Amino acid sequence: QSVCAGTENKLSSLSDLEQQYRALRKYYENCEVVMGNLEITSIEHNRDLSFLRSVREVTGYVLVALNQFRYLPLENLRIIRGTKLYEDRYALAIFLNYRKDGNFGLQELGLKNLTEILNGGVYVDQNKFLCYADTIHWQDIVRNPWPSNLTLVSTGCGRCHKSCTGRCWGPTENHCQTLTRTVCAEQCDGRCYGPYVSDCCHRECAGGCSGPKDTDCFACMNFNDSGACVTQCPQTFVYNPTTFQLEHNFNAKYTYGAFCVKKCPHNFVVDSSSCVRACPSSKMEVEENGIKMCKPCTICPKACDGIGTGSLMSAQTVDSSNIDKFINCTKINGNLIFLVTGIHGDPYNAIEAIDPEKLNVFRTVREITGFLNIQSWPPNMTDFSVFSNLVTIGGRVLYSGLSLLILKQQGITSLQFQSLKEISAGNIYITDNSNLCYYHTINWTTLFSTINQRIVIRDNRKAENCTAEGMVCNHLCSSDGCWGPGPDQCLSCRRFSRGRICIESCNLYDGEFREFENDSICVECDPQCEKMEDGLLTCHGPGPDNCTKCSHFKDGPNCVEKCPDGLQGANSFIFKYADPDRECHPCHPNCTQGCNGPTSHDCIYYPWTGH
Numbered sequence: 001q002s003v004c005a006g007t008e009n010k011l012s013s014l015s016d017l018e019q020q021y022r023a024l025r026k027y028y029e030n031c032e033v034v035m036g037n038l039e040i041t042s043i044e045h046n047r048d049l050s051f052l053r054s055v056r057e058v059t060g061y062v063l064v065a066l067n068q069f070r071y072l073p074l075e076n077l078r079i080i081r082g083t084k085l086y087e088d089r090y091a092l093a094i095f096l097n098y099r100k101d102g103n104f105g106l107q108e109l110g111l112k113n114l115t116e117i118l119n120g121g122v123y124v125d126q127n128k129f130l131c132y133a134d135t136i137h138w139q140d141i142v143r144n145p146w147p148s149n150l151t152l153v154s155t156g157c158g159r160c161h162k163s164c165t166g167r168c169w170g171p172t173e174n175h176c177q178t179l180t181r182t183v184c185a186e187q188c189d190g191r192c193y194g195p196y197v198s199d200c201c202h203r204e205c206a207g208g209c210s211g212p213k214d215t216d217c218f219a220c221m222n223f224n225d226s227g228a229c230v231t232q233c234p235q236t237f238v239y240n241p242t243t244f245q246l247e248h249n250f251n252a253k254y255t256y257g258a259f260c261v262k263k264c265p266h267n268f269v270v271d272s273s274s275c276v277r278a279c280p281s282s283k284m285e286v287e288e289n290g291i292k293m294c295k296p297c298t299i300c301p302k303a304c305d306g307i308g309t310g311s312l313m314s315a316q317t318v319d320s321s322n323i324d325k326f327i328n329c330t331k332i333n334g335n336l337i338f339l340v341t342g343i344h345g346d347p348y349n350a351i352e353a354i355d356p357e358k359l360n361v362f363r364t365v366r367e368i369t370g371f372l373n374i375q376s377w378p379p380n381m382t383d384f385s386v387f388s389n390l391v392t393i394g395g396r397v398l399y400s401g402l403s404l405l406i407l408k409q410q411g412i413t414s415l416q417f418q419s420l421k422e423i424s425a426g427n428i429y430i431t432d433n434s435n436l437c438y439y440h441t442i443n444w445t446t447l448f449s450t451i452n453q454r455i456v457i458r459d460n461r462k463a464e465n466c467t468a469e470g471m472v473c474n475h476l477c478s479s480d481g482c483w484g485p486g487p488d489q490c491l492s493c494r495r496f497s498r499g500r501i502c503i504e505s506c507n508l509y510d511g512e513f514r515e516f517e518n519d520s521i522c523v524e525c526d527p528q529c530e531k532m533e534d535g536l537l538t539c540h541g542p543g544p545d546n547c548t549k550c551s552h553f554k555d556g557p558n559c560v561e562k563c564p565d566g567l568q569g570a571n572s573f574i575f576k577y578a579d580p581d582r583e584c585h586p587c588h589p590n591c592t593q594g595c596n597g598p599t600s601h602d603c604i605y606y607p608w609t610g611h
């Protein structure tokens, strides 16, 4: 229950042998569980290492090399998990522990309780003064003996106490090696404390046991939940009999090493059912049910300084030297400016011009709290589709009353601000884009937030010379206009929408995947809803309880692929049978493996157990 990080220095040590010893002691001082590697190196002859008696478990490997002390005090080291291995091979490595051309050197191993090495091999050789080690039957300690090549122990040595002869860590009687796996009966799944069936330890017991219960283990094979060795921690979701579906489990626990905890350690957060340093890239840290945890994002939020804010205050424009400074940004706290100097750069003074493909970096942007000034753009780029996910332009700050500006650009035909829906404050100014159309089709008033917000549009390709040239808004679009060609470039849909695309109607009566309409938005019906023909809707809302008919079975109000077959419940596994009408009902509590019906005589049993 005391925890500490290990080290990964391997054969790296401090020149000052005094500081080395002091280092070791500071690290594993009163540590019971080393969540990493136990590395003991470059320690001199007379130094007491009695503080090492605190270590009961090591999840990584144990390295003992270049030492000179006499006795290794790890009499409490019960197990080494081998999550990491020395030289990618050993969970335990002991070598070259003697003074070159001297008399000092490791002589005895105090590993009286080392009965479990879950993963990896053992290397113990090149220890001039080491004794006894070779008497130990490592086959009983090392869980995975393959390749046998990786389990090597070789050795004026004393004798083992009469009580064991041939198998001891030292002369002390209580230092005789205790066998915990090889001496067991066939019936034992794992370890034992005697040669008889009644001596078998519980499945989840590592190292050995002092009893038959999963609470009598010396160490757990997987996790430790409140003293009980279990295969897994209380699940994050359990079946709720009233809602007829899995629900967040308020008793859920999380993994932290070999422990199940209710709350993760200080600098950790919950990701699914484990405790981690930081949330994975696809999730963000949030407070949910009084617990910090990682919730999947729908691109995760990431604020960034704009041109003229914070780390970019000196900047006057986005340029090749700060463009990568907007990677994965979602919200820009400030302005985004595009001046000629930034677009064309300055070759003579070695300042590269903006590489057009890198402008795709703004596709993640959804908001701009300030203004968007575009006085220059790559010649070959026809639109601003790199801003396709742009939703809001706050206009918190304005360029002399302007919140959006697009001047003198000749290489642009359309805007394509696909997701643009809000321009809080400031006025718009799109001028001198003789090749730009669609701009006249927009009802800018839709995007505004107040009456005190004007629009200024001048010498852009005449509405007429487009209107006639083929530059028209798709028919499936509202009278609010579009940002360019296609049904996926409109302000509002005329009929309905499926994603960013405007369409004629939802898949209400036909289609590969049936849908329901939610205020003009088409949403697919749950997969369990049976597709209905001849004018019948397949669903009237989302989820397995809003179907017209279930395609398989029905658990209470929910359409399910199959009735509950061993689902994790609050106190036990949930089982149900299906009546002739494919309706699910509870199995009798005495049926711990399923049933055919309600009766106590309707119990059925797993077909995959026993010979």
Ligand SMILES: *[C@@H]1O[C@H](CO)[C@@H](O)[C@H](O)[C@H]1NC(C)=O
Binding pocket: 075, 076, 112, 113, 218
């Ligand atoms: C060895 O392990 C046993 C079983 O858990 C424990 O009771 C005892 O403290 C340990 N004995 C020694 C000599 O470390």
Ligand SMILES: *[C@@H]1O[C@H](CO)[C@@H](O)[C@H](O)[C@H]1NC(C)=O
Binding pocket: 149, 150
């Ligand atoms: C392990 O045995 C293989 C089999 O030939 C050999 O190639 C390898 O070098 C050996 N490694 C060790 C640590 O003995």
Ligand SMILES: *[C@@H]1O[C@H](CO)[C@@H](O)[C@H](O)[C@H]1NC(C)=O
Binding pocket: 001, 215, 216, 217, 218, 219, 220, 224, 225, 226, 227, 228, 229
């Ligand atoms: C499990 O952890 C508890 C602390 O809650 C500890 O007292 C117990 O010895 C541990 N059990 C095993 C087998 O490690």
Ligand SMILES: *[C@@H]1O[C@H](CO)[C@@H](O)[C@H](O)[C@H]1NC(C)=O
Binding pocket: 356, 357, 378, 380, 381, 382
């Ligand atoms: C614009 O031209 C540049 C020339 O280097 C090219 O790399 C980029 O892909 C082009 N961008 C467009 C219009 O897709």
Ligand SMILES: *[C@@H]1O[C@H](CO)[C@@H](O)[C@H](O)[C@H]1NC(C)=O
Binding pocket: 540, 541, 542, 543, 544, 545, 546
């Ligand atoms: C079922 O449909 C209703 C609307 O009819 C909706 O409000 C409810 O959330 C849906 N239930 C779910 C989420 O399965």
Ligand SMILES: *[C@H]1O[C@H](CO)[C@@H](O)[C@H](O)[C@H]1NC(C)=O
Binding pocket: 281, 327, 328
């Ligand atoms: C931003 O997220 C992307 C996608 O996960 C990743 O490739 C990139 O390294 C991240 N950059 C940052 C914010 O450091």
Ligand SMILES: *[C@H]1O[C@H](CO)[C@@H](O)[C@H](O)[C@H]1NC(C)=O
Binding pocket: 443, 445, 446, 479, 480
């Ligand atoms: C567009 O702006 C608002 C509604 O979006 C409304 O006041 C105005 O009449 C609309 N104009 C047209 C012709 O759709």
Ligand SMILES: *[C@H]1O[C@H](CO)[C@@H](O)[C@H](O)[C@H]1NC(C)=O
Binding pocket: 462, 464, 465
């Ligand atoms: C407008 O000028 C363009 C040349 O950019 C020409 O193709 C088009 O026919 C003209 N339309 C009119 C008559 O305004």
